[PDB]
């Protein structure tokens, strides 16, 4: 009647053709208008298998964001192969908008509506949709920002928890606001993010008890990344076209998980960055004048589990990320493409 299949999708958005904002410009030419009033069909007595970690929809979204970032976030200096590439690097208007992903004729998307579906396994409550929900192509590491939330309990996602090389997506059920600001009035690159410590330490405690559920009640420990580039050893994200790097050591303070005020994380705006799209560093212009500010919802955490042989009663976790495909996985997990026959 139908079968799992991979096909070329098309996007839909409510982009405004009159906006200078780069996401709106990209979606104006790339996407079609949103369906005025769609309608999903619940599939009765149907159990379908989903695998968020082998979902072709993730690949296509990755191509879009790479395309969006290369058409509108071009740097002053870039390392293509072995040559240096000079070019203009004007400041842009940058604010991600939601993008819907739709199937062409002869195909359809199946949607897993199981409240606590972990992404890999069977799903007893399935429906078919013409398009997905509006996903914002938010590029970040360590913390997943401005995403959707789990409808009930926190969810631990991983193709396999035994494999310490597999990223862990902690899907939160209650956002924790992060308020990052580069003030108007010394060093024009100094910034900081403020986070509600009372709220964060409580959410982080509920994350430990959910991890205990998956690791034989072993003690859960959080540590800062052991090494790697600044884009993964720190919370890396883009705000108003500026690239922020924030020290998150205070967000994983083990003593405060069972200390609860305003956590001010040291941040820095960097002009020289290691591109997530592929290879090479990129150099941009210094930050814009004025008060640069971004308030985002922390809706998920990216974790890498230590391979401590499991002989110890502990289990250390460190904020991961870097593979931006994981960010799209956290939003496309409930979807999959099938072909009609």
């Amino acid at each position, epitope marked *: 009647v139908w079968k799992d299949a991979d096909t070329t999708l098309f996007c839909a958005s409510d982009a405004k053709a009159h906006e200078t904002e780069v996401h709106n410009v990209w979606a104006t030419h790339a996407c079609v208008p949103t369906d005025p009033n769609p309608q999903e069909i619940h599939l009765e007595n149907v159990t379908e298998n989903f695998n968020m970690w082998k979902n072709n929809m993730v690949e296509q979204m990755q191509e879009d964001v790479i395309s969006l970032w290369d058409q509108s976030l071009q740097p002053c200096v870039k390392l293509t192969g072995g040559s240096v590439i000079k070019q203009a690097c004007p400041k842009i208007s940058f604010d991600p908008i939601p993008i819907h992903y739709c199937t062409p004729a002869g195909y359809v998307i199946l949607k897993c509506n199981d409240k606590n579906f972990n992404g890999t396994g069977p799903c007893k409550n399935v429906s078919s949709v013409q398009c997905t929900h509006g996903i914002k192509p938010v590029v970040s590491t360590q913390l997943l920002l401005n995403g959707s939330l789990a409808e009930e309990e926190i969810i631990i996602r991983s193709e396999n928890l035994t494999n310490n090389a597999k990223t862990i997506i902690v899907h939160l059920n209650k956002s924790v606001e992060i308020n990052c600001t580069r003030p108007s009035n010394g060093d024009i690159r100094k910034a900081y993010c403020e986070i509600n410590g009372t709220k964060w330490n409580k959410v982080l405690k509920q994350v430990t008890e959910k991890l205990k559920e998956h690791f034989n009640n072993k003690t859960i420990i959080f540590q800062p990344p052991s090494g790697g580039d600044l884009e993964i050893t720190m919370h890396h994200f883009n705000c108003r076209g500026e690239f922020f790097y924030c020290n998150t050591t205070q967000l994983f303070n083990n003593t405060c998980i069972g200390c609860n005020g305003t956590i001010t994380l040291p941040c820095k705006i960097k002009q020289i960055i290691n591109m997530w799209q592929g290879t090479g560093q990129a150099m941009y212009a210094p930050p814009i004048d004025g008060k640069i500010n971004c308030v985002s919802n922390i809706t998920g955490i990216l974790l890498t589990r230590d391979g401590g042989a499991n*002989n110890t009663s502990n289990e250390t976790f460190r904020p991961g990320g870097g*593979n931006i495909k994981d960010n799209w996985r956290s939003e496309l997990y409930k979807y999959k493409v099938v072909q009609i026959e």
Partner: antibody
Amino acid sequence: RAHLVQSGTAMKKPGASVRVSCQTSGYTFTAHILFWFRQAPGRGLEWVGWIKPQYGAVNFGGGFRDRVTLTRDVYREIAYMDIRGLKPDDTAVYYCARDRSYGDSSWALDAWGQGTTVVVSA
Amino acid sequence: YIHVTQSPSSLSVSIGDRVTINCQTSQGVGSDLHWYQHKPGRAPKLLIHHTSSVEDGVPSRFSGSGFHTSFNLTISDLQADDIATYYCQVLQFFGRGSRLHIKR
């Protein structure tokens, strides 16, 4: 296609440190995890750690995080392993191997370096 | 921890013979079981990944089978190049190996 070549054998006293390097070629360097294993004489392969070259994310086996540093040069496509505080029982052949899986991780190692013999003796 | 045991540890073999060696697991492993060949002084070589998928370039006489906690590496029409130790692997856990030596 993929081919990994490691550095020559090392002679170190106790307490010293060592750097084993692993030059790669013939494939997309950042799309493949690089693992580090060692084999002491008579024993089986022991896992040291891995590194994802894209941003240099690392992970280690039992007790190796405290003395091993794993870095890479994405441009020269070469991976490094720095071991500090060498003990006599660190004597082994250290191997550099690549994951066959493009992007993801399967732990199936289809490309291997010839190995690097490291001896720690006073 | 996934303890990997291979039997027989040592094995007397003769050219042209069919050989089959077993690898067992502490826990259910499914199918991501990998087989390697290792000769002294050289680097190991990937023979089969995920139980039954033989790597390109490996002689067709190599084969793999098994599931869950028991996996077999089979060679039909053994040759002088197939004499070596053979490791099975899951994640970071390599087996001690099973060494072949010609029988006289």
